[PDB]
Paper text:
DHAR catalyses the reduction of DHA to AsA using glutathione (GSH) as a hydrogen donor before the spontaneous hydrolysis of DHA to irreversibly form 2,3-diketogulonic acid. To expand our knowledge of the underlying molecular mechanism of OsDHAR activity against ROS, high-resolution crystal structures of the apo-form, AsA-bound, and GSH-bound OsDHAR were examined at 1.9, 1.7, and 1.7 Å resolution, respectively. The structure shows that the asymmetric unit contains one molecule of OsDHAR and adopted a canonical GST fold, consisting of three β-strands and three α-helices in the N-terminal subdomain (residues 4–84) and six α-helices in the C-terminal subdomain (residues 94–210), although OsDHAR showed modest sequence identity (~20%) with GSTs.
To obtain crystals of the AsA-bound protein, Cys20-mutated OsDHAR (C20S) was used, which lacks reductase activity but exhibits AsA binding activity. The AsA-bound OsDHAR structure was refined at 1.7 Å resolution and contained one molecule of AsA bound to OsDHAR in the asymmetric unit. The AsA bound to a pocket at the cleft that separated the N- and C-domains of OsDHAR. In detail, the 3′-OH and 6′-OH groups on AsA formed hydrogen bonds with the side chain of the Lys8 and Lys210 residues, respectively. In addition, the 5′-OH group of AsA interacted with the OD2 atom of Asp19. The C1′-carbon of the bound AsA was 5.0 Å from Ser20, but rotation of the side chain may produce a suitable distance for catalytic reduction by the Cys20 residue. In contrast, the bound AsA in OsDHAR is surrounded by α1, α5, and α7, forming the H-site20. The bound AsA in OsDHAR interacts with Lys8 and Lys210 via hydrogen bonds and forms van der Waals interactions with Pro21, Phe104, and Trp207.
Residue numbers in the entry: 2 to 212
């Protein structure tokens, strides 16, 4: 039986949390229909049994059954791909890095207390780049259908949308038609609904960092 340890909601240890790296792994298992047991970890009060298997406190960690817990959502989703090849979620190498700078540009903008430091323009630039790729190779990152790159980016765009809307009243411009089509499609997938954090918990996860 496959098991995964993921972040719990801040202040709510029995509730699924908002780690986008955790969600990437959960989405992968859900989309590949792999049965798994989810273990919720309060990352501000990690249980000792967990530190024994993840001594650096890394979350998520994945146990494919083969008697070992592995970290790093990149590595984990590759291991899952190898163990459960169908449906294939392989993203072509040429598209692997589509949207790679979006999350970091988002977190900088989110935490920016200077409305004119160019952190917004940076984010738009990356969003613009994503909009161009989907315009040419939509609807997903590999046209159709869904692949690993989508399951990595979707959780991050969810953070961007919810957090920027809440903390800065900022929205992805309507002009970016393909991106809006993209997030609408991805966020409404059964797997995404099942594995996403309630928005209040995502907001709670970011609030201390904003302040
Ligand atoms: O990047 C992340 O988004 C959430 C949020 O809670 C910020 O801490 C978190 O746990 C991640 O590591």
């Amino acid at each position: 039986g496959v098991e995964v340890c993921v972040k719990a909601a801040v202040g709510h240890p029995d509730t699924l949390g908002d780690s986008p790296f955790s969600q990437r792994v959960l989405l992968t298992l859900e989309e590949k229909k792999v049965p798994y047991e989810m273990k919720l970890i309060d990352v501000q009060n990690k249980p000792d049994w967990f530190l024994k298997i993840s001594p650096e406190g890394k979350v998520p960690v994945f146990n494919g059954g083969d008697g070992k817990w592995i970290p790093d959502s990149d590595v984990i989703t590759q291991v899952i791909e190898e163990k459960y090849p169908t449906p294939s979620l392989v993203t072509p190498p040429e598209y692997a890095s589509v949207g790679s700078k979006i999350f970091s540009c988002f977190t900088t903008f989110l935490k920016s207390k200077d409305p004119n430091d160019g952190s917004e323009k940076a984010l738009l630039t990356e969003l613009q780049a994503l909009e161009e790729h989907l315009k040419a190779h939509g609807p997903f990152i590999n046209g159709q259908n869904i692949s690993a790159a989508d399951l990595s980016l979707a959780p991050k765009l969810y953070h961007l949308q919810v957090a920027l809307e809440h903390f800065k009243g900022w929205k992805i411009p309507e002009d970016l038609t393909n991106v809006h089509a993209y997030t609408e499609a991805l966020f409404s997938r059964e797997s995404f609904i099942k594995t996403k954090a309630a928005k209040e918990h995502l907001i709670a996860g970011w609030a201390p960092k904003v302040n």
